[PDB]
């Protein structure tokens, strides 16, 4: 029972923490792309404003 508990919790935590790490990387990437796209829109619409 102890061995099954540790194996099952390791198997679940691996597939859960890989997803969590990938989601963290995607969140940081998404906010950085949000900054870059914000600059892109704020300059495109500013020039098109003129």
């Amino acid at each position: 029972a102890m061995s099954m508990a540790v194996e099952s919790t390791g198997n679940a935590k691996a597939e859960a923490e890989s997803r969590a790490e990938a989601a963290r990387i995607e969140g940081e990437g998404s906010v950085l792309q949000a900054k870059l796209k914000a600059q892109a829109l704020a300059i495109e619409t500013e020039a098109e404003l003129e």
Partner: protein, 51 residues
Amino acid sequence: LAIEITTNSQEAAAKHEAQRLEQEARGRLERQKILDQSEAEKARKELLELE
């Protein structure tokens, strides 16, 4: 038949003793199999932690 009921009687008792010893030997083999499997599961605990 008076000695036949003696050779049969002594071999039946020998057969009964052999079954007693065989079951005792199998009884202790069941002890050792389960204990060895318990030690194997003990080691498998850290094996599965590492895995």
